[PDB]
Point group: C3
Chain length 264, copies 3
Amino acid sequence: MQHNLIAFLSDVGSADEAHALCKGVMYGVAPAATIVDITHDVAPFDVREGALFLADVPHSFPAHTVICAYVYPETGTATHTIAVRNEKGQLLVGPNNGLLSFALDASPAVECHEVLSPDVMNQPVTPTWYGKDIVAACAAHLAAGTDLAAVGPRIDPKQIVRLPYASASEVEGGIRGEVVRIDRAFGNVWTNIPTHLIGSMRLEVKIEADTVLELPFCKTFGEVDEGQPLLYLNSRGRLALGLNQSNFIEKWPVVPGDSITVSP
Amino acid sequence: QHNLIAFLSDVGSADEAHALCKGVMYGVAPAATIVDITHDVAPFDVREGALFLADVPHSFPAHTVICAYVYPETGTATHTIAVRNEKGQLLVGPNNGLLSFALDASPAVECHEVLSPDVMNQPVTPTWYGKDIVAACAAHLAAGTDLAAVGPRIDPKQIVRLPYASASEVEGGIRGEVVRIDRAFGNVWTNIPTHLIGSMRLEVKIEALSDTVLELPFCKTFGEVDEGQPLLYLNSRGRLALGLNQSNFIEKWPVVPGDSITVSPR
Amino acid sequence: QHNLIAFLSDVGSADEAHALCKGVMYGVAPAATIVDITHDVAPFDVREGALFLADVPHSFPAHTVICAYVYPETGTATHTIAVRNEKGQLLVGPNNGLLSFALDASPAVECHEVLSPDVMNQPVTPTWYGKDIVAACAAHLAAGTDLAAVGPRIDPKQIVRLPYASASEVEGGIRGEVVRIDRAFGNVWTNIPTHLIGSMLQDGERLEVKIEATVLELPFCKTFGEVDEGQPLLYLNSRGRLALGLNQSNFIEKWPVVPGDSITVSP
Ligand SMILES: C[S@@+](CC[C@H](N)C(=O)[O-])C[C@H]1O[C@@H](n2cnc3c(N)ncnc32)[C@H](O)[C@@H]1O
Ligand SMILES: C[S@@+](CC[C@H](N)C(=O)[O-])C[C@H]1O[C@@H](n2cnc3c(N)ncnc32)[C@H](O)[C@@H]1O
Ligand SMILES: C[S@@+](CC[C@H](N)C(=O)[O-])C[C@H]1O[C@@H](n2cnc3c(N)ncnc32)[C@H](O)[C@@H]1O
Ligand SMILES: [Cl-]
Ligand SMILES: [Cl-]
Ligand SMILES: [Cl-]
């Protein structure tokens, strides 16, 4: 039942003190906790980007983790904060605005509460920063031995707002998916096409804003010459496009939501 | 005890430099927790660093060593100081005004110049007192060195302070200025405190190379206006701020620190 | 014992990737302290990563595991290595030259290839050996795994080394080059060590520098504040090598210079 590791995500940036003031509040409540950032460089207000960044956090982090996350343009409104215990035994705290959707896909909710108890908040709560005074504060209380049931009333899992996620499908001559996100440090393109779908089938890849490439399917970057394009399964088990030691989206610009079709 | 070190500088987080300081600190105080405030203070910008530190004493617990350096005077006669504040925290930094606003929040009770070689990383490199004096001294304090071992007592009046303009009641409203931009979002932060905005949609007059006059609703939070619409609100630091709901105010209406802001009834 | 993990990569700090590695490491070594060096090494730039690691052994205590990857060879025959240095630290990284300059600072005493599946995060994903081999193995070492259990011993000469030339005395001067930019400030760092400029300094301490990319006549100073704001200076940087800067301004914004550009210094 111990949760001494707090994994922390927001959209407030890492460039000023704000993300650190949250950690100050958390160390004051849970002075023995380990606090590690996931990132604070989610694009402003971008709940979907935050949700995508959290997707693989449950799997990589141990059971004694509190996932503390906010992207909270609804701060100071009726949009509540929730605290969840997942099937892995981790705790998650965040706004009920879809942010935790893909982390919960990875490890479903077992018990879910609205955070309404003043005793798990940093008082007085400032309306424009529930992320510090409710989300961070509550996560730290959970790390410091507070029972999940003490944060507020139980809700059903279906009361957690979920962001829709497009799945790739078999079409009439291949697999139709889309760009989910860019691997931005490198310029690699990540799709929603899972391992099991490319199983069936060099491949033709059609990128719609329209470009057709004939690409080798490789296990890794070094299997083609430097600067050459490849298809590969990324670290997350989904089909990706890259140039070996270059930047694919600088050569073929593509944004999230663009269609990607793969055929023999 | 002071086993939590909160660390700020202007050396950036993009290369190893900020981490070499943590290596020195972990060597001296291997049981300390080190947490960054930020290393992305603009280069040489002591005032920006001072503003970023202002609310650190209130948010961090009493067992914190606030370790901060923006030190273009490194290797000169500008000394490093170590301070114990009214909250019981310790602060270490260049006596160049960097700690000024943190000390406004929680005044100095005890002040020393850091002159003892035994709290430094020897030999001290002239271009990086931040590592070899500031960071090293903070770690010795985290490891339980008495504040008196760092060097001699000085009067708190010898702590260099940065000037800070106050807002005031003027003919028919409140006149202040822009203190900083909430840069992740483009929100505008003023020096107008909650207590002055009590008597009084409001007229907001921004004076820069051109004047921008807006009629804005006073809201508790962003979602009280439509997406893209402007609002006046009290920020998380208790001061009047301007923003657009889920958009960037300064991208629409450019404003920089030092610009005048008046708020008056419609 | 090695309870402190110092972590470097090229995956950036802007998304979750660097943190997923920390999650794996905390799972394996729950009592370890993890501190980033940086994740903002330029993509695939092994030499930049090697330069960022050069001064890590000296600054970090003996109980450190230096965990580093810049690994465009991930999923190939380029193995991960684990090394014990003369300071008693452990280092884990791709055998692609990344650890070269850290090993210059504190040489390898024992070296192994990381091949044992029991020090990896299974199943190992081919495009991220940095998570599933480098980070996982560093965590196992921090948790107390013996260095010899990671895989077979190799000779130090089997560690790939990136070439680095220090400057030399030529007819009447020092011929060096730009190694890296102090990018937060725009200061220029050369390969000219302390002992070479020492030999050439006279009373008044003024030098000529020729940049091939400009001739400047510059004062040799201890620190920035010795000349007026905006004025140029030569100085020995924090790492013991000659540098160029403007006091409280950006030298490379005025005089653009990139790594490998010649810098000649004469009386
Ligand atoms: C105001 S920020 C807190 C940090 C800020 N620098 C401070 O010190 O108050 C907290 C949340 O507010 C939201 N937010 C910030 N500016 C906003 C705006 N203009 N419109 C809507 N939401 C905003 C963000 O999504 C963020 O998660
Ligand atoms: C030199 S930096 C230390 C980090 C650097 N990357 C290193 O490894 O030496 C330390 C301090 O020097 C100051 N500084 C750096 N470059 C400067 C310059 N050109 N003029 C004046 N001060 C400078 C900064 O304000 C900073 O707080
Ligand atoms: C793929 S990155 C791991 C992080 C990534 N965001 C992920 O989640 O998989 C691991 C290593 O891959 C290398 N790498 C990434 N993209 C590459 C590409 N297009 N070509 C060659 N190497 C690449 C980098 O050098 C890096 O050290
Ligand atoms: Cl918030
Ligand atoms: Cl310094
Ligand atoms: Cl890798």
